[PDB]
Amino acid sequence: PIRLRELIRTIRTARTQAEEREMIQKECAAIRSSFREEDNTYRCRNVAKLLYMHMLGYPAHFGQLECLKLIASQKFTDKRIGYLGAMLLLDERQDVHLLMTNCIKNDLNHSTQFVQGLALCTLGCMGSSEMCRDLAGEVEKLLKTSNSYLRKKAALCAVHVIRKVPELMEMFLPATKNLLNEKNHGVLHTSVVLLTEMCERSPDMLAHFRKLVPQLVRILKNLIMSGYSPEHDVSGISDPFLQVRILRLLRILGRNDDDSSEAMNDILAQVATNTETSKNVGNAILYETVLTIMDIKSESGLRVLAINILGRFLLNNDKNIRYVALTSLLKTVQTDHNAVQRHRSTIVDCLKDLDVSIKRRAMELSFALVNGNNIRGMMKELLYFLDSCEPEFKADCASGIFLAAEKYAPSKRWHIDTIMRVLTTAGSYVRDDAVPNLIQLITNSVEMHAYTVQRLYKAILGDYSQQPLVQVAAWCIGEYGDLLVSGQCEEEEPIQVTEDEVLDILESVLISNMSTSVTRGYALTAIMKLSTRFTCTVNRIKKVVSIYGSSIDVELQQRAVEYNALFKKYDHMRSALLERMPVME
């Protein structure tokens, strides 16, 4: 039985990855040999070594039955090792935790306060959809006990069961009633967390849990007044976790009612000015209070104080403070949108910040703050940011710009120009999913087609490696070939479109190696539709379709065969099915 320290030293002595793997296998061989003999004396050392090997990146499937055997043991060290193994290498998808239900039930009634607590912690950490069903009765029994060290564990187990089984929340309503007077900070925090979880799970308990709002307000006031305490008082803040839980409960309570919001208005006002934000705990408490005020129907003064606090925090040089302020502003976008326009300069400056999280938050705030009047002004800023954006943020910026144009576009011509510019500059950053949206938007608009067709023709002749831009150009050509070239049945004056460049471009795109089989299909569809839409270049695409009917792609080959058959046998009926598709929202 090698000790854990000896095994750790041996592992640290290995330098090469192959040498480390060989040492791990050598240790696992001895571990498996010991396990196969049903060893019970040095089982703790073997279990620790197996856990270390699993955490180091080695398989531990064979060490599954040993953990189950050690869990039902009587030694405290063996029970702890088994619980640790079940928590680490045991999961819902393991399928070996089903037998652990009997062991948990046996240990759930143990007189020792450590074995029962360890079993409850393991059950909470590895709660399964079936273990909680057969363990709900035992969990509720411990929730009504007066054990302060066990009350928090029971609350955590109940919360885990409710999260795993939302339909089991009905059995916890009569158990948590009259439990807001706990003197211990941990018990009160657990009760607050359980109440918040119950409120967030279903709204039926909101009315029942809304009567305790005065009690929660009184508890918060007492905690604020008792600012000195050896326990839970860190950096001058007493019960920061309890204060955060209380603020979250207040924000989640009364968000759509005036009585609940009015009851906690005094507490929010007192905490909004009587809190020290010099430390990180104070800043977090202030952010939680601001979020709760923004999420509840508070007074105008509370909103003004929250706006002032957010403005003060936005100027803080701390990256965490700036990120918290940006998150609060994004959350408070729809609520108090008029007051959010005062930080437009700060939002613009945050885009140039050297923080990836800060830059993302600033971009999200700018996207959410785009209105029907600042869209035209913000378009230039968005284009500049997209031009000088990170490689991983160019696609997100383009998607946000497209969404903003589709939502609050000042005009179709301006929106069309912005979309074309984004497509030409996005390149390989525009998602293929936005192509159907752009096609639908183009089909919906029936007033600007000649200018859009000309722009697409100009932008498609230069480059064709942009799959989304290429697909958009092909769709535009297939939809408006009759408007892209006017009076091009025969030879005419030299214009931008001559009725032959489009066919050559389509053929090059179809035969170009930079085709993913989606743009090629769009080009083939456009060529097929151009037979009836365009009559100047007739009897020329039929040869290409016949030649393209033997393509390697099965779908492409079938499409080419169908096109050739339609061109060679249904020439009169070719125009009978080339009508424009309907336009819908």
Binding site: G117, C121, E231, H232, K319, S357
Partner: protein
């Protein structure tokens, strides 16, 4: 609730791991590798907050070994940092001048302390002395 907590060293080695979400072993390893690459590929002025897979990944390492967490977008961000600082202080008080060497050898003690402090991604004891006394009593049981 904390989706996962991972204690990874500056060299990339992970000294602690505690995930509250039932995920596949290969998926968990891939997620841990991605988190290490993102954190290891981040500067000192990144705000210690990362939105990876819609998860508030907060990184705050007080030494060569860094710390990570997986917080959902439903709670405050400073609360996670305060909880991490409190856990570090409690571990230091329980151990006494906690360094990297003791973390590898005493990983079981750290896991037991984490279990006794945070269960299921949520907090279990807001105080810093009651948890230490409970851990000492549990250890003294034999």
């Amino acid at each position: 609730m904390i989706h996962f907590i991972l204690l990874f060293s500056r060299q990339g080695k992970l000294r602690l791991q505690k995930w509250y979400i039932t995920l596949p072993d290969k998926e968990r390893k891939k997620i841990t590798r991605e988190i290490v690459q993102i954190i290891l590929s981040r500067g000192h002025r990144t705000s210690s907050f990362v939105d990876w897979k819609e998860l508030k990944l907060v990184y705050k390492r007080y030494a060569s070994l860094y710390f990570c967490c997986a917080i959902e977008n439903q709670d405050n961000e400073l609360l996670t940092l305060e909880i991490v600082h409190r856990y570090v202080e409690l571990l230091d008080k329980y151990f006494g001048n906690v360094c990297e060497l003791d973390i590898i050898f005493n990983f079981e003690k750290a896991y037991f302390i984490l279990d006794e402090f945070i269960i299921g991604g949520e907090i279990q004891e807001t105080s810093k002395k009651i948890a230490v006394k409970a851990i000492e009593d549990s250890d003294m049981l034999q």
